Motif scaffolding. Structure first.
Motif, PDB file in Angstrom:
ATOM      1  N   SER A 144       0.824  -1.203   0.000  1.00 12.96           N
ATOM      2  CA  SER A 144       0.000   0.000   0.000  1.00 12.96           C
ATOM      3  C   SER A 144       0.862   1.259   0.000  1.00 12.96           C
ATOM      4  N   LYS A 145       0.379   2.301  -0.670  1.00 12.87           N
ATOM      5  CA  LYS A 145       1.104   3.566  -0.750  1.00 12.87           C
ATOM      6  C   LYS A 145       0.188   4.759  -0.490  1.00 12.87           C
ATOM      7  N   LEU A 146       0.653   5.702   0.324  1.00  9.95           N
ATOM      8  CA  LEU A 146      -0.077   6.948   0.528  1.00  9.95           C
ATOM      9  C   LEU A 146       0.053   7.803  -0.726  1.00  9.95           C
ATOM     10  N   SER A 147      -1.071   8.293  -1.239  1.00  8.13           N
ATOM     11  CA  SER A 147      -1.065   8.977  -2.526  1.00  8.13           C
ATOM     12  C   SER A 147      -1.968  10.206  -2.583  1.00  8.13           C
ATOM     13  N   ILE A 158      -5.125   5.987  -0.334  1.00  9.76           N
ATOM     14  CA  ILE A 158      -4.248   4.825  -0.257  1.00  9.76           C
ATOM     15  C   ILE A 158      -4.398   3.966  -1.508  1.00  9.76           C
ATOM     16  N   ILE A 159      -3.316   3.838  -2.268  1.00  4.95           N
ATOM     17  CA  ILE A 159      -3.326   2.985  -3.448  1.00  4.95           C
ATOM     18  C   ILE A 159      -2.709   1.633  -3.111  1.00  4.95           C
ATOM     19  N   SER A 160      -3.549   0.605  -3.056  1.00  8.37           N
ATOM     20  CA  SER A 160      -3.091  -0.734  -2.711  1.00  8.37           C
ATOM     21  C   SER A 160      -2.870  -1.548  -3.975  1.00  8.37           C
ATOM     22  N   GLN A 208      -3.330   0.258 -13.146  1.00  9.02           N
ATOM     23  CA  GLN A 208      -2.566   1.493 -13.223  1.00  9.02           C
ATOM     24  C   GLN A 208      -1.592   1.414 -14.394  1.00  9.02           C
ATOM     25  N   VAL A 241       0.162  10.948  -9.939  1.00 10.68           N
ATOM     26  CA  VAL A 241       0.056  10.429  -8.605  1.00 10.68           C
ATOM     27  C   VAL A 241       1.363  10.594  -7.857  1.00 10.68           C
ATOM     28  N   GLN A 242       1.271  11.105  -6.652  1.00 10.70           N
ATOM     29  CA  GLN A 242       2.409  11.353  -5.781  1.00 10.70           C
ATOM     30  C   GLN A 242       2.414  10.382  -4.600  1.00 10.70           C
ATOM     31  N   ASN A 243       3.176   9.311  -4.768  1.00 10.72           N
ATOM     32  CA  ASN A 243       3.354   8.338  -3.718  1.00 10.72           C
ATOM     33  C   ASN A 243       4.403   8.794  -2.707  1.00 10.72           C
ATOM     34  N   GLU A 244       3.996   9.098  -1.479  1.00 10.30           N
ATOM     35  CA  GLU A 244       4.930   9.484  -0.420  1.00 10.30           C
ATOM     36  C   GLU A 244       4.504   8.809   0.872  1.00 10.30           C
TER      37      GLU A 244
END
Length: 149
Positions: free
Chosen positions: A7-10, A42-44, A97, A146-149
């Motif tokens: 999972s990624k915070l986006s 959250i992009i899982s 994606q 999309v900004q994954n941080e």
């Protein structure tokens, strides 16, 4: 078959670089901003057994359990967390994606349930709404940052 990997915070943004966010009516909208816990998603990522690409799930971070769904070609938020497993080759909560060929930094989200359908920004009147629609070769509206941080 889909198996959750990570999972990624986006923070998702259209080309007008208006941020995506969920409003109080549970409706996904786009806006320019300068409030904020409604923009964090959250992009899982899932592993696809058919290997069609990178299968993802989009859910909002600051809720108990709201996952993005395109059931009946209509954008909505189900009351659920992303599952460990999905035992089918298609899912209304599953998107592919895909990085756009001739654009750098830009992704598009193809529906797994409805082939050739994509998440997109749509002007209605005074609102920029997230919708499901089909793809023109270019079509800016289905492209996202999309900004994954």
């Amino acid at each position: 078959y889909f198996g959750k990997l990570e999972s990624k915070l986006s923070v998702i943004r259209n080309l007008n670089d208006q941020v995506l966010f969920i409003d109080q009516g549970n409706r996904p909208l786009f806006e320019d901003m300068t409030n904020a816990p409604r923009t964090i998603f959250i992009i899982s990522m899932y592993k696809d057994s058919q290997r069609r690409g990178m299968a993802v799930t989009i859910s909002v971070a600051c809720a108990a359990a709201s996952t993005l769904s395109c059931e009946n070609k209509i954008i909505s938020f189900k009351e659920m967390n992303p599952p460990d497993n999905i035992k089918d080759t298609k899912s209304d909560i599953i998107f592919f994606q895909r990085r756009v060929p001739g654009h750098d930094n830009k992704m598009q989200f193809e529906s797994s349930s409805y082939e050739g359908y994509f998440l997109a920004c749509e002007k209605e009147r005074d609102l920029f709404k997230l919708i499901l629609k089909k793809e023109e070769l270019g079509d800016r509206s289905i492209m996202f940052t999309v900004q994954n941080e």
